[PDB]
Write an enzyme that holds these catalytic residues in place. Structure first.
Site, mmCIF file in Angstrom:
data_model
loop_
_atom_site.group_PDB
_atom_site.id
_atom_site.type_symbol
_atom_site.label_atom_id
_atom_site.label_comp_id
_atom_site.label_asym_id
_atom_site.label_seq_id
_atom_site.Cartn_x
_atom_site.Cartn_y
_atom_site.Cartn_z
ATOM 1 N N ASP A 395 0.866 -1.170 0.000
ATOM 2 C CA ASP A 395 0.000 0.000 0.000
ATOM 3 C C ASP A 395 0.906 1.226 0.000
ATOM 4 O O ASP A 395 2.119 1.105 0.160
ATOM 5 C CB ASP A 395 -0.937 -0.021 1.216
ATOM 6 N N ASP A 689 -1.739 -1.145 5.645
ATOM 7 C CA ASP A 689 -2.191 -0.430 6.829
ATOM 8 C C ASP A 689 -3.473 0.319 6.502
ATOM 9 O O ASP A 689 -3.472 1.253 5.695
ATOM 10 C CB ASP A 689 -1.127 0.548 7.336
ATOM 11 N N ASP A 693 -7.305 -2.347 2.909
ATOM 12 C CA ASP A 693 -6.579 -3.573 2.623
ATOM 13 C C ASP A 693 -7.175 -4.811 3.276
ATOM 14 O O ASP A 693 -6.543 -5.870 3.223
ATOM 15 C CB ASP A 693 -5.120 -3.436 3.075
#
Length: 973
Positions: A395, A689, A693
């Site tokens: 991410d 995080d 996700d």
């Protein structure tokens, strides 16, 4: 019934379905397509009431007419008007009717007490084989050896009891929500019921002081401020608003999830706030994540994938080993009452008892090494997946960049002069612009924390004035997403007339500002920051001596610059994954022009490596392949990725093999980017995080979450360091745990085999190995160096070489055999060296095998064999590519040294009454028995330092084959 097939079963599940046929034939039967065994019903509460819990959901389906499965979402098609009609409470007689259909609103863990849990562990065909071995060796009277394989199978069970009672204690801690909850009744009451009696269709009044949450309710009336750190880790306060009249998975801003902690809970309309209960214990968020832990997906690490090879080899050594016993013992004139027992005794030495005890303890040191570093793993078998990772998806925000936006400085405009960007905003003097950035905020000075928009709170401490000379007069227009801007009128003591401050985007505001004030170089000034990843906002003022007169005929004063920096530990980690040749992918949902300028900084796209943006169309036309000029990579987009996976299925593996930057990805599209790479036979990792996700961390093979203490929104590796420097630590630990599990296995085998060969070289001449000798060997020597073998640790630098991943491969079978040849040419090289001695006398052969033989034909075999085990442990325990050198393991050198010294003593200078050795080997024959142990010690290190340097002259994964095609010809034109 005649169902007493139990009597038949006494005689004794590999084929459960087959077994099932025996048990029974519109009740108590369920084939749930996965092991087909869930038989339950209750039939209570004066109804039909199907009951069966398959993994904790209730499934009220006994028929098709008056029953329907999925208690989760059986009232999912509700309307937003319907939950406002449920503002009143359910009737108290009807409250104990919905408790039958739904659960007791407690996500429960069974206690599984010690008589109930020892029976679930010992009931397996590999502890019942050794309970047969207790009563087999004890037919030779009063053995010590029949005690050791009871005492090292009570370590094999008690370590399996410890890893189970500590895992279920962890899950029982996080779901403890004991709290008494005030509700409303059907007519004007509170009644203060327990939280284990809440059903959907009830009201719920929140406490304004404190409390976490009973259950995921929809905010039907009022305002609330929560702390989502328990469910997503994003610990910023989230403002919850009342549900408008007119979808629980869509309206996240109107639901108060079970586990999140509520903080303010102001009413602002009536005397208090109201909620409407939606789900319950096993069917909520934090109830669906726990149900995804205690029934996990099967891991794709096929440890001992062959499943028949070892067993058939076992068969040959056991049988071609036990028919040599029946061929030599029958030529020794036996009365046949014991040949059978001698052979079964030979089969019980090829199955080592401490094999489950040493594979269990190898994983407990792995969790004990990650807990020291920070990573908290809960599924013990997913450690070995980190060694086999060819691909890691990241991410962007919070993961390898900063969490929130950070300001760079101010680009002012004093007479269209374009004075440049100041590095520190604390250095320009006070004016209409310095007063501007400190008062136009939608924050709230409450409980000593500025809470509101994450952007404008960052520019509060950018200069740092006092808060709560300017004074908050009036907020003329709130910051809405539709009109994009926010106007605040401010005053101060010493003013002629108040000014009107407003902030927004550069382009939309300057189109409303004075055209004589905005200069002609405004487009390129907008261009120079929108292409380098900078987020830029403008500001304006107008003095006032209501309506939109506050926003009109504005002067352009200056520009404010925001920029997400990289973390300092991002750039050496992305380079350390590219250097070790595992591929790095960024999967973001942010802008595309920002994602490219970051992936050049951190190092997905190194300089002098081209990348090309695809940018396909919503129409079924071509891919258009735009290039970029600033190996080979591809930068995708959000709506672009849907076009290839739908309309171009033959061109999809040509994109995911060489596509690095995925931007604008939907949170429901991050999960099939992972599930498509797993169909290219990648083994994908996922460092992430947030709440975006949550679908992709589960689908990945190693899902890692950052910056949280002990949570469950991860697959399993929640860590707690808030950097991507933990993602090499999972590679580097999962590699030293994947070959340590190989070094433990290929030592047990080497020990069983040396023992089969010393009991077989002693079955000829009828001189079977002793009583305390079998004990010594096993317990001491082979359990001390197997429990302590797996404490070495991970290395300090990653490498290009993966672990071999397959246990029964051609480098493993060959080493074992060569080592066996060195082991049998030294016991035969020690037996046929005593036979040429002048002091040598044979054994009294015709008495019995274990009864009255303290002879010289076992003393030499026991001495040589003890050392063989210690030599072999050290030989099989190497750490040059992966683990660590073994002298760092200080409690493993002390075993080897102490055990070796006792052993050298029992061969030089006692334990002669015990262990039944021959009294004194008189001459200096003792000193060259240590000679051919030394050339076994030298001859084993100089045998595996040669055999691992072997290249046999003679792309298994799907992606590797595709990569070869790409190397030959690049796919893009």
């Amino acid at each position: 019934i005649p169902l007493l097939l139990f009597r038949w079963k006494p005689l004794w599940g590999e084929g459960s379905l087959e077994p099932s046929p025996q048990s029974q034939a519109g009740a108590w039967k369920d084939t749930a397509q996965l092991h087909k065994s869930e038989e339950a019903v209750s039939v209570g509460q004066k109804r039909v009431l199907r009951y069966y819990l398959f993994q904790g959901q209730r499934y009220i389906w006994i028929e098709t007419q008056q029953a329907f499965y999925q208690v989760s979402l059986l009232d999912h098609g509700r309307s937003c008007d319907d939950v406002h009609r449920s503002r009143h409470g359910l009737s108290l007689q009807d409250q104990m009717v919905r408790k039958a259909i739904y659960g007791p609103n407690v996500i429960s863990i069974p206690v599984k007490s010690y008589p109930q849990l020892l029976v679930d562990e010992a009931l397996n065909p590999y502890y019942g084989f050794q309970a047969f071995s207790i009563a087999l060796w004890l037919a030779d009277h009063y053995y010590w050896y029949a005690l050791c394989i009871f005492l090292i199978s009570s370590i094999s069970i008690c370590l399996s009891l410890y890893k189970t009672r500590k895992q279920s204690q962890t899950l029982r801690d996080m779901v403890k929500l004991s709290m008494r909850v005030c509700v409303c009744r059907p007519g004007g009451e509170e009644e203060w019921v327990d939280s284990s009696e809440l059903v959907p269709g009830d009201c719920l009044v929140l406490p304004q002081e404190g409390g976490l949450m009973p259950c995921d309710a929809a905010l039907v009336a009022g305002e609330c401020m929560v702390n989502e750190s328990s469910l997503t880790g994003e610990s910023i306060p989230v403002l919850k608003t009342a549900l408008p009249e007119g979808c629980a998975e869509t309206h996240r801003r109107h639901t108060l999830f079970c586990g999140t902690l509520i903080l303010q809970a102001r009413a602002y309309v009536g005397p208090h706030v109201l909620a409407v209960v939606t789900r319950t214990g096993f069917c909520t968020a934090k109830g669906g994540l726990v149900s995804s832990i205690l029934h996990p997906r099967p891991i794709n690490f096929k440890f001992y994938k062959h499943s028949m090879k070892f067993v058939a080899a076992l068969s040959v050594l056991a049988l071609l080993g036990t028919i040599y016993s029946i061929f030599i013992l029958y030529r020794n004139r036996v009365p046949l009452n014991e040949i059978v027992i001698r052979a079964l005794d030979l089969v019980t030495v090829v199955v080592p008892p401490a094999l489950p005890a040493a594979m269990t303890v190898c994983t407990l040191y792995a969790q004990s090494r990650l807990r020291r570093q920070g990573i908290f793993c809960i599924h013990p078998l997913r450690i070995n997946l980190g060694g086999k990772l060819q691909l890691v998806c990241f991410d962007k925000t919070g993961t390898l960049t900063e969490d929130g936006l950070d300001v760079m400085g101010v680009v002012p405009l004093k007479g269209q002069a374009f004075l440049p960007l100041v590095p520190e905003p604390r250095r320009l003097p006070v004016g209409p612009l310095l007063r501007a950035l400190a008062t136009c905020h939608a924050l709230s000075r409450l409980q000593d924390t500025p809470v509101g928009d994450p952007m404008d709170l960052k520019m509060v401490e950018s200069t740092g004035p006092q808060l709560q000379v300017p004074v908050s007069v009036l907020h003329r227009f709130p910051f809405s997403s539709a009109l994009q801007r926010m106007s605040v009128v401010v005053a101060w003591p010493g003013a002629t007339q108040p000014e009107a401050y407003v902030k927004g985007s550069p382009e939309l505001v300057a189109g409303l500002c004075n055209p004589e004030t905005v200069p002609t170089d405004f487009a390129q000034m907008l261009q120079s920051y929108t292409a380098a990843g900078y987020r830029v906002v403008a500001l304006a003022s107008k003095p006032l001596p209501t309506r939109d007169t506050v926003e009109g005929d504005l002067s352009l004063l200056g520009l404010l610059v925001m920029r997400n920096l990289l973390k300092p530990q991002t750039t050496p980690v992305i380079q350390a994954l590219r250097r070790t040749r595992i591929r790095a992918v960024m999967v973001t949902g942010d802008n595309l022009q920002t994602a490219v300028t970051v992936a050049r900084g951190c190092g997905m796209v190194a300089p002098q490596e081209h990348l090309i943006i695809v940018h396909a169309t919503g129409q079924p036309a071509s891919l258009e392949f735009l290039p970029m000029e600033s190996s080979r990579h591809l930068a995708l987009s959000g709506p672009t990725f849907g076009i290839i996976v739908k309309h171009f299925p033959k061109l999809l593996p040509k994109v995911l093999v060489q596509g690095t930057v995925f931007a604008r990805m939907a949170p429901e599209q991050k999960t099939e980017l992972v599930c498509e790479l797993q169909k290219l036979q990648y083994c994908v990792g996922m460092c992430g995080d947030g709440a975006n996700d949550c679908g992709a961390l589960k689908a990945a093979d190693v899902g890692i979450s950052l910056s949280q203490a002990e949570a469950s929104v991860v697959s399993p590796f929640t860590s707690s360091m808030a950097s991507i420097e933990c993602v090499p630590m999972v590679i580097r630990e999962g590699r030293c745990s994947l070959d340590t599990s190989f070094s433990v296995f290929k030592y047990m085998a080497l020990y069983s085999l040396t023992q089969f060969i010393s009991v077989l070289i002693l079955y000829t001449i009828n001189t079977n190995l002793g009583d305390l000798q079998f004990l010594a060997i096993d317990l001491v020597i082979t359990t001390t160096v197997a429990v302590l073998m797996s404490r070495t640790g991970p290395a300090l630098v990653l490498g290009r070489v993966r672990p071999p991943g397959a246990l029964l491969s051609v480098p493993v079978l060959s080493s074992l055999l060569l080592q066996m040849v060195l082991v049998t040419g030294v016991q035969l090289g020690g037996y046929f060296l005593t036979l040429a001695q002048p002091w040598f006398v044979p054994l009294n052969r015709t008495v019995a095998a274990p009864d009255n033989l303290p002879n010289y034909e076992n003393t030499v075999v026991f001495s040589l064999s003890s050392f063989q085990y210690l030599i072999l442990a050290a030989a099989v325990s190497k750490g040059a590519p992966f683990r660590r050198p073994l002298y760092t393991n200080v409690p493993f050198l002390v075993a080897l040294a102490l055990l070796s010294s006792v052993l050298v003593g029992l061969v030089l200078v006692l334990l002669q009454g015990p262990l039944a050795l021959r009294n004194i080997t008189d001459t200096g024959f003792k000193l060259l028995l240590l000679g051919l142990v030394t050339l076994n010690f030298v001859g084993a290190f100089m045998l595996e330092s040669v055999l691992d340097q072997c290249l046999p002259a003679c792309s298994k994964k799907r992606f590797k084959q595709l990569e070869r095609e790409l190397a030959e010809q690049p796919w893009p034109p």
